[PDB]
Amino acid sequence: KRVQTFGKKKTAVAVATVTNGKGLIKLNGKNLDLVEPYILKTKVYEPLWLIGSGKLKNLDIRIRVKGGGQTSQIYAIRQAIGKGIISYYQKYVDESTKKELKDVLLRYDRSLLVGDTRRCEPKKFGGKGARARYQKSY
């Protein structure tokens, strides 16, 4: 009936709710096809193409996003969708089929299921950034 998984990036958080339904997918109350940067639209569509249309007809997905920027928000949504489909199968379908799907997403890449640990570094006085120092003159 219902699960809730999240995906994360630098400061973006995406929460996906997966239920039984008729096939809809929506983001912040619009279709997925209104995600803004068009050149990055293939990222969101990757997991849907791998598993196929066969296993996803009977589900509805809702996603909310908060924080970050253009690129980080897109990447968090990929992770939310991929993890959510996996967890829905664990709870309401046999898990031997779940293992087969988790194999499929892994042979393409990780980071469809594993978060990224990189994070911004603080700055220190005596320079402009974390490493760059003010120019010395002699």
Partner RNA sequence: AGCGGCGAGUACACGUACUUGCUAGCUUCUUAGAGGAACAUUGUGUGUCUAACACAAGGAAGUUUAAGGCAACAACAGGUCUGUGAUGUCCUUAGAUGAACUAGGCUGCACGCGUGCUACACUGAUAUAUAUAACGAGUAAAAUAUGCUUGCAUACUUUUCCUCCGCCGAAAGGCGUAGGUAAUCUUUAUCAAUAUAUAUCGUGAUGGGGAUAGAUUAUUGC
C-alpha dihedral, 71 to 40 to 25 to 54, nearest 10°: -130
Residue 43 in the binding site for RNA (CB under 7 A): no
Minimum distance of RNA from residue 49's CB (angstroms): 22
Contact 17, 80 (CB under 8 A): no
Asked whether 48 and 82 are in contact (CB, 8 A), the reply is no
Residue 16's identity, in one-letter code, is: A
Q: Is 30 in the site for other proteins (CB under 8 A)?
A: yes
User: Does 4 help bind RNA (rule: CB under 7 A)?
Assistant: yes
Q: Which residues bind RNA (CB under 7 A)?
A: 4-6, 11, 13, 15, 21, 24, 26, 28-29, 36-39, 60, 62, 64-70, 73, 114-115, 117, 121-122, 124, 130, 134-135, 137
